[PDB]
Ligand binder design. Structure first.
Ligand SMILES: [Mg+2]
Ligand SMILES: [Zn+2]
Ligand SMILES: [Zn+2]
Lengths: 75, 1327, 49, 99
RNA sequence: UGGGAGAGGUA
DNA sequence: ACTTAAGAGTCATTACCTCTCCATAATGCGAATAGTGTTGCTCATTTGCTCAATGA
DNA sequence: TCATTGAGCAAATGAGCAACACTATTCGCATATAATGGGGTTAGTGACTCTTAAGT
């Protein structure tokens, strides 16, 4: 995800949807201070979220149902 | 703050008084003792808000504790000072004056509403002549412009019944007394009795104007300004200078003029002034108000103090330095740098070297954030001073911040979309931005003093755009054509050519090696050169059916340099990639093959490694230029002496007086062209194969290792024309008058020119340098016009499910193949199947993206023409679907929905503007008596199809041309089959027998004369413009009959065998002779960038081609006039159509045959409007695409046809209606074609008749102005006309364009913002 | 004095001397500019002049 | 030359131009078309609003970048308000119709 | 500090 | 009833750097109004200090 | 018996107002031999389109 975001593009299916999903994940890492599921190896949150999509943990519907799970566990 | 629409309309005086906060009643702005603003002035605090934050003028209320109050001492409302640029005033004008926009912007709208001439309205406004409003008597009607003498007559005559006023108040009273619905109804009745052309157009213009007023709800009295509003005093600011003197805006001067003349008019109306003085003052106020609204419009422009015309409001908004194009579209931008660019070849593909000081200045608030986070600075002031002192902990924090934070490298002029790329920056010590050498083919940047801008994305969304969309490892392929633009350029190319070339017996020839590593070991040890022909063992990896890689290992006859590059070439490519001498086209094919096989990441590392090895081995080469390397051919002086002797021989023949001067001139040019070609060929021979001193077989020959030939053959820098000017002959240089000079520049750039040859060369050098500047300006103007047409086009749907398409045949005009089927169709989506047996019976289904494998199958089975879905035929409303467009050329797969096509298409078109067997089809013929076949049709094409089924060439034969070969005959090459009379047009027949000379008498239709060579008489039919009174009603006919005299019929039809021949016919055939079938009877005689701009602006040319509007036979109906009318009646129904043709133009189609829909009646260039309206949408699309691509192939630039089809689809947006059904379209209103498609869909859903239409090809300027969005149109061009039409019609903007959301300030519906915009659209729909 | 100071100080031809080396001084004095008061512009100049 | 945040103009409230007066680089019409061709709508929005003539948005952007949270608080620019006031001072009612 | 003209230069 | 001339209008690339330059003319004399100084006075703000319960 | 919490209070300083008296600004008004129609552009654009008007 440092040099090329190609395999994350093939995992997502859309460049613009990849930007939107990684933006929400990076906002959750910058604002809320959530736990990154990958080793950060002293990278920035943009590359960490892109590496999470590169592995395949972060998707639009997966992050939405996870956010829904945290919201329903808040209530 | 979240608004759906920007509604524009006219402004009532009540609305202007509702905007304002206080009447401005004094011209003086501020004081001079203390600089506080005045009371009721142009800068007044009580009207325009307070000067300081939360403070009055006297100093009573001075804190936020008194949040909002009015000061009882000085009236200054205690608020923030931001409301000094949000509060307007108003001037109460004494005499109500007229708006200059809705009076002078043609059409005037006041002359078009009141139905009075503009000169008479201007005479009324200039107080020169009275106008009468109402009159009870029948002598004075409404709108009868009286003079002063006529009004003084009428005053003493009636004096009580009529009321006539003079000036703008009279026009206000006239617009008040008129009745909109009554005049609209009267003109609707007036339109129905008779319809002259000019009267119906004027009446429908007035009816459209009146219906616009009634449907918008405006009133016609609102065009007369009674209350004039005032701009806020921080939008017409008062800025000082450095020496105490003030430099105000010109708006303050114009407002001072209006206020002073209005106050003087109030004083003159109170002082009971004479009529002449008060009329002149009313005229001065009108002139001052019109100057403030538009200075240069009404008369002489009011100049300021420094003899320059002042800037009004219309000059602030409209123009090149207006508000729109200087601040709304393109703004200045913070967090931005600029420096010179140098070369960094130690970098990777996605890196650039920012300097330390410049990036410290760029990333300064980020350094503030990390300093306060790490606890090294308590406050923002301490962090500011720690950065300003440039400490070592600040440099370490900057090294941590700039890591993995991409910046955009922009370089102006950004022609295409690769002029902005995002790079991960690497901090270097210096002052120059170190680019990668590969991206300077995309940037079009050489290092001769260039400068690049560095913009820093701030937010996380912006960093992700720069990381996923705009990273320099992502856009390798160019978006114009699907070829890689990250390509080795000139230095890597010279190095790789010197590597993979081979000598004959260089060093260590004929060994056997254990592989690529031992070959590299041999070269770097020095026992073998780079050019030794050696046998190596190569283990190449082929690709399996799935993603696995099988291997093969054998011995190949290679060189050492190719066996060094096999360490670089990744696993997956064959050895035929590497095993030739690599020019620039060869390395382009290498990167393209590596892309299509492996993907992106092996392609990125292959480009970096091939650049490293190219640079390293070009350094180890030492490829130098010298004066012994530009080898002059040793037979140059002999050819030059022979050419000068031959030119002198023709010169003395002309001086003797045999050959004329023009033929001498043409002969001298042809001789010097042949001499220049011979010298250039001898030079190219002696430079290509001069290396002949060889050994180890015998004296052998090979290509030369000369460096000039090396950097020419590699495609690195230059071409054979440049090598010809260096070593051979300079050639024929042209004068600035276009004519080629007779004597050429014989010397080259090695022997040195003399004085006169250099002075001749300066003509073409300065002409080329002058031409280059002009084309760039033209290309940028063309690019702006193309972008502002194709703004509103984005992908919306995934598939529309249409069955239309454009059948892509390879363009086969002339003697060669211009574009193959691979370049024509690779990328698009097949509409129908491919129904041909062939050899393997390929059957691709519909909705299939044509990959390279499918195109390879099409090449193997040799398909002639395939029908694929185009952008023009797409059936999606407000945007196209992905399946009609096809392949995203920058990526290499299908196009994602939501990506803006039209901006990429317009950029790709307007970027190279700074560089600019016998087969018979459509026949009707008859076999003659000798077998020399003649054709009786004009539209006959002679197709040349090979034995496999594919087409080789194409030729169009004339009507009446002779032909020796029939269908199915396979003739060899070089045989001249095209035999035709070029100057004469025959009138040939298809039956035999005798001729009856009927309806021609010597004296009134034919001229009795003889031929001067044979003595036989010849009967030339006299033209009707010089005939006598007896020939004004007859048409002479060659009445062909049988052998005894009965009227023979045409076989198949019922028309008698007659031939109405036209005039000027050389009739050699007389009566009483035998006539065969098919023989003749008589002889009847006959830039790049401006062409692109005239095709796209859709200009009717200087001599249009007359076409047939209805299918059927053609006959003449009108006599005794030279304007030849054609009564082209159909063969089934009656004729409602005629056509007017001028005198001197000739005709191709005679009055005895039958033409189809869209036949060429008069030859010449055919206009694209009638091409569309007669042939069809696909035909005009194919015409525009072929004639644009002819220009772009003449100059040598590859551009895919889908971009030109996008511009054509954006040009065809309008559709006038010829007959309505039940929809809300009355007659001839040019509505958008998407609107009538939606209306027809709704009408055929609920079961009604529907409304037909007819499209019309608008130009680029007219389409972008007749775009339904007044903000997009006024940002493009003609801001005065667009805002006037929108204000009168009461239009609104729905905010659906990319340019609109750039101006407003939202996310554009293009790419990432498409999801947000469709969510907002469904939120508005569901609620 | 106002007219002669305007011409010698703020005309279109009385321009700031490019004197960064002696060659630029001598080629700015041997210069024949076809523009100025009563001449062409950069808009009214085609490939003829 | 480089600029982080300096002086701003008075009519349009967008940053100044020039190395001598600490100016920002112009993001011209050609570059707006290049961002439209890329599809970087978020980069285009943050280069037309918070790096340019929008005082509330740029002040909240500066405070958010200093406070670590790289978030976007957009708004309407002030050159558009300059345009609305100039058309209204010409005498043509243009308004932002809500919904 | 900010604005407007005129001249020159670089890509 | 339609067809050529005259006239008006509207555009003609992008980005950056340097320099200079951006004004002169009637006097005077009361009337009247805005501005500033003067003195007495009140009112809001803050701080060290004092007074009253309360358990340890 | 004393530290801690809850409440308040005289006093000093900062802000300001209200009415009145002096004074520097500013504006309306008057000049009496006779005086009786103005400067200042743009000048080697090109191409195209729209409207109006004489010509057929
Ligand atoms: Mg350059
Ligand atoms: Zn106040
Ligand atoms: Zn479609």
């Amino acid at each position: 995800a440092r040099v090329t975001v190609q395999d994350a593009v093939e995992k997502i299916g859309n460049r613009f949807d990849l930007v939107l999903v990684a933006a929400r994940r990076a906002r959750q890492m910058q604002v809320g201070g959530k736990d990154p599921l990958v080793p950060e190896e002293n990278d920035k949150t943009t590359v960490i979220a892109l590496r999470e999509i590169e592995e395949g943990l972060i998707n639009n519907q997966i992050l939405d149902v996870r956010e829904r799970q945290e919201q329903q566990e808040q209530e | 703050e979240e608004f759906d629409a920007i509604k524009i309309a006219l402004a009532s005086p009540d609305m202007i008084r509702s905007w304002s906060f206080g009447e401005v009643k004094k011209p003086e702005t501020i004081n001079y003792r203390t600089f506080k603003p005045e009371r009721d002035g142009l800068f007044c605090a009580r009207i325009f808000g307070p000067v300081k934050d939360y403070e009055c003028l006297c100093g009573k209320y001075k804190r936020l504790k008194h949040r909002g109050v009015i000061c009882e001492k000085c009236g200054v409302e205690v608020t923030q000072t931001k409301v000094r640029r949000e509060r307007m005033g108003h001037i109460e004008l004494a005499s109500p004056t007229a708006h200059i926009w809705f009076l002078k912007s043609l059409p005037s709208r006041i002359g078009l509403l009141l139905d009075m001439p503009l000169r008479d309205i201007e005479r009324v406004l200039y107080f020169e002549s009275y106008v009468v409003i109402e009159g009870g008597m029948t002598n004075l009607e409404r709108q009868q412009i009286l003079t002063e003498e006529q009004y003084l007559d009428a005053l003493e005559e009636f004096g009580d019944e009529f009321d006539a006023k003079m000036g703008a108040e009279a026009i206000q009273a006239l617009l008040k007394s008129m009745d909109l619905e009554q005049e609209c109804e009267q003109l609707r009745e007036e339109l129905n009795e008779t319809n002259s052309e000019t009267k119906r157009k004027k009446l429908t213009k007035r009816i459209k104007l009146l219906e616009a007023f009634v449907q918008s709800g405006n009133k016609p009295e609102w065009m007369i300004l009674t209350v004039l509003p005032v701009l806020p005093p921080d939008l017409r600011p008062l800025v000082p200078l450095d020496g105490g003197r003030f430099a105000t805006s010109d708006l303050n001067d114009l407002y001072r003029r209006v206020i002073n003349r209005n106050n003087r008019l109030k004083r003159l109306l109170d002082l009971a002034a004479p009529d002449i003085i008060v009329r002149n003052e009313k005229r001065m106020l009108q002139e001052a108000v019109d100057a403030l609204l538009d200075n240069g419009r009404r008369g002489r422009a009011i100049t300021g103090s420094n003899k320059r015309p002042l800037k009004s409001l219309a000059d602030m908004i409209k123009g090149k330095q207006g508000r729109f194009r200087q601040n709304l579209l393109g703004k200045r931008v913070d967090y931005s740098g600029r420096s010179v660019i140098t070369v960094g070849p130690y970098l990777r593909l996605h890196q650039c070297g920012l300097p330390k000081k410049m990036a410290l200045e760029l990333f300064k608030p980020f350094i503030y954030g990390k300093l306060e986070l790490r606890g090294l600075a308590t406050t923002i002031k301490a962090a500011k001073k720690m950065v300003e002192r440039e400490e070592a902990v600040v440099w370490d924090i900057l090294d941590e911040v700039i890591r993995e934070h991409p910046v955009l490298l922009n370089r102006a002029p950004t022609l295409h979309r690769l002029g902005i790329q995002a790079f991960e920056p690497v901090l270097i010590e210096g002052k120059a931005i170190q680019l990668h050498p590969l991206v300077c083919a995309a940037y079009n940047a050489d290092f001769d003093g260039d400068q690049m801008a560095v913009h820093v994305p701030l937010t996380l969304e912006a960093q992700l755009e720069a990381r996923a969309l705009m990273m320099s490892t992502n856009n390798i392929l160019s978006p114009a054509n699907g070829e890689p633009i990250i390509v080795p350029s000139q230095d890597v190319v010279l190095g790789l050519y010197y590597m993979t070339r081979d000598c004959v017996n260089a060093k260590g020839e004929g060994m056997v090696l254990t592989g690529p590593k031992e070959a590299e070991r041999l070269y770097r040890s020095g026992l073998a050169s780079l050019h030794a022909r050696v046998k190596v063992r190569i283990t190449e990896y082929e690709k399996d059916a799935n993603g696995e890689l099988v291997a093969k290992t054998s011995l190949k006859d290679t060189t050492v340099g190719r066996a060094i590059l096999w360490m670089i070439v990744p696993k997956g490519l064959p050895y035929s990639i590497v095993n030739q001498a690599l020019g620039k086209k060869a390395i382009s094919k290498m990167l393209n093959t590596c892309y299509r096989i492996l993907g992106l990441k092996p392609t990125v590392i292959f480009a970096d490694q091939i650049m490293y090895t190219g640079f390293a081995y070009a350094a180890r080469s030492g490829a130098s230029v010298g004066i012994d390397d530009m080898v002059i051919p040793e037979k140059k002086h002999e050819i030059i002496s022979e050419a000068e002797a031959e030119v002198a021989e023709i010169q003395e023949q002309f001086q003797s007086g045999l050959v004329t001067a023009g033929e001498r001139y043409n002969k001298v040019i042809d001789i010097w062209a042949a001499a220049n070609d011979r010298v250039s060929k001898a030079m190219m021979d002696n430079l290509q194969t001069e290396t002949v001193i060889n050994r180890d077989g015998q004296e052998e020959k090979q290509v030369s290792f000369n460096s000039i030939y090396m950097m020419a053959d590699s495609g690195a820098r230059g071409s054979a024309a440049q090598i010809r000017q260096l070593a051979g002959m300079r050639g024929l240089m042209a004068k600035p008058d276009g004519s080629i000079i007779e004597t050429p520049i014989t010397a080259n750039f090695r022997e040195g020119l003399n004085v006169l040859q250099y002075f001749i060369s300066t003509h073409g050098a300065r002409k080329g340098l002058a031409d280059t500047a002009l084309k760039t300006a033209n290309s940028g103007y063309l690019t702006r016009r193309l972008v502002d047409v194709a703004q509103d086009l984005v992908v919306t749907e995934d598939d529309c499910g249409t069955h239309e398409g454009i059948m892509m045949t390879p363009v086969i005009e002339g003697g060669d193949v211009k574009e193959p089927l691979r370049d024509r169709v690779l990328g698009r989506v097949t509409a129908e199947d491919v129904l041909k047996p062939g050899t393997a019976d390929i059957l691709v289904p519909r909705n299939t993206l044509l990959h390279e494998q499918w195109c390879d199958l099409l090449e193997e089975n040799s398909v002639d023409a395939v029908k694929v879905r185009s952008v023009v035929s797409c059936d999606t409303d407000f945007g196209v679907c992905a399946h009609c467009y096809g392949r995203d050329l920058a990526r290499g797969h299908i196009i994602n929905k939501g990506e803006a096509i039209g901006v990429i298409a317009a950029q790709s078109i307007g970027e190279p503007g700074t560089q600019l067997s016998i087969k018979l089809s459509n026949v009707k013929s008859v076999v003659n008596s000798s077998g020399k076949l003649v054709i009786t049709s004009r539209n006959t094409e002679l197709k040349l199809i090979d034995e496999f089924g594919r087409t080789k060439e194409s030729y169009k034969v004339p009507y009446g041309a002779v032909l020796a070969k029939g269908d199915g005959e396979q003739v060899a090459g070089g045989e001249t089959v095209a035999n035709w009379d070029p100057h004469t047009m025959p009138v040939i027949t298809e039956v035999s027998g005798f001729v009856r000379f009927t309806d021609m008498i010597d004296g009134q239709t034919i001229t009795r004369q003889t031929d001067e060579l044979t003595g036989l008489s010849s009967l030339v039919v006299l033209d009707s413009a010089e005939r006598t009174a007896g020939g004004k009603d007859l048409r002479p006919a060659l009445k062909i009959v049988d052998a005894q005299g009965n009227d023979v019929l045409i076989p198949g039809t019922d028309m008698p065998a007659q031939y109405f021949l036209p005039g000027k016919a050389i009739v050699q055939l007389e009566d009483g002779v035998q006539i065969s079938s098919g023989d003749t009877l008589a002889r009847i005689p006959q830039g790049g960038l401006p062409r692109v701009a005239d095709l796209f602006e859709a200009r009717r040319p200087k001599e249009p081609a007359i076409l047939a509007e209805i299918s059927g036979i053609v006959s003449f109906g009108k006599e005794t006039k030279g304007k030849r009318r054609l009564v082209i009646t159909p063969v089934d129904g009656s004729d409602p159509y005629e056509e007017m043709i001028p005198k001197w133009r000739q005709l191709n189609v005679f009055e005895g045959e039958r033409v189809e829909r869209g036949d060429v009646i008069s030859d010449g260039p055919e206009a694209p409007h009638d091409i569309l309206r007669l042939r069809g949408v696909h035909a005009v699309t194919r015409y525009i695409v072929n004639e644009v691509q002819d220009v772009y192939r003449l100059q040598g630039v590859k551009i895919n046809d889908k971009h030109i089809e996008v511009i054509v689809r954006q040009m065809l947006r309008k559709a006038t209606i010829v007959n309505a059904g039940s929809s809300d379209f009355l007659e001839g209103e040019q509505v958008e074609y998407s609107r009538v498609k939606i209306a027809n869909r709704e009408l055929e859903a609920n079961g009604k008749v529907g409304a037909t239409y007819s499209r019309d090809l608008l130009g680029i300027t007219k389409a972008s102005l007749a775009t339904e969005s007044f903000i997009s149109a006024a940002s493009f061009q003609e801001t005065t006309r667009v805002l006037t039409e929108a204000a009168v019609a009461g239009k609104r903007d729905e905010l659906r364009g990319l340019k609109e959301n750039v101006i407003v300030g939202r996310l554009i519906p293009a790419g990432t913002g498409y999801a947000y915009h469709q969510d907002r659209m469904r939120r508005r729909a569901a609620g | 004095s106002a007219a002669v100071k305007e011409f010698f100080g703020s005309s279109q031809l009385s321009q700031f001397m490019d004197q960064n080396n002696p060659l630029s001084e001598i080629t700015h004095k041997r210069r024949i500019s076809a523009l100025g008061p009563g001449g062409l512009t950069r808009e009214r100049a085609g490939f003829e002049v | 030359h480089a600029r982080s945040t300096g002086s701003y103009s008075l009519v349009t409230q967008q940053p100044l131009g020039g190395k001598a007066q600490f100016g920002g680089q112009r993001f011209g019409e050609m570059e707006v078309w290049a961002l439209e061709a890329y599809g970087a709508a978020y980069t285009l929005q943050e280069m037309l609003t918070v790096k340019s003539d929008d005082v509330n948005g740029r002040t909240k952007m500066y405070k958010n970048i200093v406070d670590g949270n790289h978030q976007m608080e957009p708004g309407m620019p002030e050159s558009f308000n300059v345009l609305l006031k100039e058309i209204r001072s010409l005498g043509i009612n243009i308004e932002l119709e809500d919904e």
